[PDB]
Design a binder for this molecule. Structure first.
Ligand SMILES: CSc1ccccc1CC(=O)N1CCNC(=O)C1
Ligand SMILES: [Zn+2]
Length: 140
């Protein structure tokens, strides 16, 4: 589990969104596994606006933050899980790191701020849903 809290937005994995998230929906995209809802309080996270390929992510199944090198956001085939059939997921970055399903939501960050959240993984791989192209998260 986990979310990004920027401005009056809460960014979560679409497959982990609650009824309150769907009832206060701003935007959602199943192909990216992302959903954004509105918040009453302002958050403290800042979004990275960059092309970094190195950063650090949080792994809840290890209580640890790991430094990783990660690929550029791309369209990648992801195997079936409890939440999606086997399919192509867009805007996804891969790194070598430990992941388990409840690890989704952990933040990946670089020197510029938050890059994205854990969304896929398995077999020593971890996938991140990128948020750096969602410029509207910085306003309104
Ligand atoms: C970090 S998500 C995760 C991690 C380990 C195992 C499983 C998951 C989620 C899942 O069932 N799959 C199916 C296979 N492909 C995936 O990348 C995701
Ligand atoms: Zn960066």
């Amino acid at each position: 589990s986990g979310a990004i809290y920027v401005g009056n937005y809460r960014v979560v994995n679409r497959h982990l969104a609650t009824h309150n998230d769907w009832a206060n929906l701003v935007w959602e995209d199943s192909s990216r596994d992302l959903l954004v809802s509105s918040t009453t309080a302002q958050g403290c996270d800042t979004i990275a606006r960059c092309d970094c390929q190195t950063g650090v992510y949080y792994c809840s199944s290890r209580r640890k933050h790991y430094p990783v090198s990660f690929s550029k956001p791309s369209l990648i085939f992801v195997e079936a899980s409890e939440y999606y059939p086997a399919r192509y997921q867009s805007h996804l970055m891969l790194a070598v790191g430990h992941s388990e399903p409840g690890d989704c939501g952990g933040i990946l960050r670089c020197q510029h701020g938050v890059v994205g959240i854990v969304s896929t993984g398995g077999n020593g791989l971890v996938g991140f849903a990128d948020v750096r192209d969602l410029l509207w998260l910085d306003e309104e």
